[PDB]
Design a binder for this molecule. Structure first.
Ligand SMILES: [Ca+2]
Ligand SMILES: [Ca+2]
Ligand SMILES: [Ca+2]
Ligand SMILES: [Cl-]
Ligand SMILES: [Cl-]
Ligand SMILES: [Cl-]
Ligand SMILES: [Cl-]
Ligand code: NA
Ligand code: NA
Lengths: 158, 134, 135, 157
């Protein structure tokens, strides 16, 4: 069969008149590098589960995208992250919502699916479970970026 | 909001979605990203989907599962399903956004009704394609 | 887990589901009850559904929406969809439970694959029926 | 006007051998009173939304059923409650998960649906939202019953 990957970094009011070329270039570069990582994995025969997990992990690690590092701020100036993963072969799934002390939500979600008998975990319970299973606790400010904080400030201004 | 979908060489589908939420979000709000069938879904019999947009609407319309259900029960092609959900059904509920989707035959789509969607796709053994605007 | 579904005199459907979860539950676990499409769903075009059972499976199989979809896209009757989901699909995934459903035409169904389900139903202006065990 | 209601109080391994008639009558009586209440509201022209909301509130209030009062206990001897409500007319919905200080989660869910732009709220966040809308904080102990607590100790052992 044919093997293929697709990824996104969010849909919305992205527009030519508020974007600089260098910014667009950085996005093209990041999307290109991550989709390629995925292609090569698929090409080498890695599982679709591993592929989407790693692609999303890379989108989280990239500060340009609103997930993981670079998460937007709530009105409280905190970060609340959510993620889900689903395996079409077993129909097993894992999900976390409202976590603030886990570096990579997608990994936490997969942890829920594979290391618990549950599908969805939220908040501090999710965090506590993840720590029990060996995932690191991070300080809540690792996700913070000036760009996203400036967006909060501008949202408040209007 | 970010996401990924993939079909592998063994025929398996998978999907994943991750988000930081919304700027100025009311603490405790949960959108579609972590809800199975809303922002993320996959089934070897139909499709794999990851969504991005106005969470509330994607939850109310079970966007991700709906793609699957329309193909599985309705007979719609992957393209037909994406059109109905993304261009007709979600806007009627007041929602904006898009999704990425791969079906079990290897068709891939990246519909969005917004000005743009950060995205990329590529088949194994081939050159990738990226996009920001329409 | 408890729930209710109804069709009013104006032809509108609605569903509600509420739960304390599970005895000895891992703090933070969420089941199907508060998730739209899983443990609770209502659409005037098809059906109103409230579920109770092995939460994990109801989420994975989107049980509540699936009833609606099997009817709306698949053309199954309420009874046929209920049988598909509750007696075939759910058990195949290791799931146990049941649900209550009312479709847009006033049909009502209360399937469950367990030994019992505390339930009741009644048409406006008629005597109600209660149940614990299987008929 | 083929108006109709159905309610449930949970599916599971309910067995005749492990139950007494009197336990059975209590459950039958509670189910009947709640369904009748719903039926009468329907007859009076009340909306489906109002009807399922009230039905579920009564089931919450009743200690026999695992929702609200009579909620089961987590591993840590706490109560974590969830609920959802959906209006098939508008396709709007409201839901709360992980709430421990709101007496009637279905009412909080309905508040999310009607008094916010959102569909789902969780935890502290969902509670603060409810408080700002005028819902009062309760002690998590109000849900506690010796019956469910005994089941917890029996589940541990
Ligand atoms: Ca692996
Ligand atoms: Ca598991
Ligand atoms: Ca080529
Ligand atoms: Cl430049
Ligand atoms: Cl089927
Ligand atoms: Cl059983
Ligand atoms: Cl007697
Ligand atoms: Na990121
Ligand atoms: Na109760």
């Amino acid at each position: 069969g044919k093997a293929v990957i697709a990824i996104h970094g969010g849909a919305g009011a992205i527009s030519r008149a508020q974007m600089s070329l260098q910014q667009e270039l950085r996005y093209i570069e990041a999307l290109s590098a991550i989709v390629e990582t995925g292609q090569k994995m698929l090409e080498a025969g890695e599982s679709a589960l591993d592929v989407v997990t790693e692609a999303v992990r890379l989108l989280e690690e990239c500060p340009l995208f609103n997930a993981g590092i670079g998460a937007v701020f709530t009105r409280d100036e905190t970060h609340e992250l959510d993620a889900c993963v689903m395996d079409g072969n077993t129909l097993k799934a894992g999900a976390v919502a409202g976590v603030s002390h886990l570096r990579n939500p997608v990994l936490a979600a997969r942890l829920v699916m594979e290391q618990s008998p549950h599908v969805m975990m939220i908040g501090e319970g999710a965090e506590n479970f993840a720590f029990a299973r060996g995932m690191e606790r991070v300080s809540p400010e690792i996700f913070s970026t000036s760009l996203r904080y400036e967006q909060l400030l501008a949202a408040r201004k209007e | 909001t970010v996401g990924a979908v993939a079909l592998d060489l063994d025929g398996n589908l998978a999907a994943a979605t991750s988000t930081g939420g919304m700027t100025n979000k009311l603490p405790g709000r949960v959108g579609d990203s972590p809800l199975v069938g809303a922002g993320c879904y996959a089934n070897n019999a139909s499709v794999a989907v990851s969504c991005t947009g106005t969470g509330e609407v994607f939850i109310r319309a079970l966007a991700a599962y709906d793609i699957a259900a329309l193909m599985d029960y309705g007979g719609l092609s992957l393209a037909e399903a994406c059109e109905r959900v993304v261009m007709e059904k979600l806007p009627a509920l007041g929602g904006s956004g898009g999704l990425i989707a791969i079906d079990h035959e290897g068709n891939v789509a990246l519909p969005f009704n917004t000005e743009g969607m950060y995205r990329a796709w590529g088949y194994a053994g081939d050159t990738p394609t990226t996009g920001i605007y329409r």
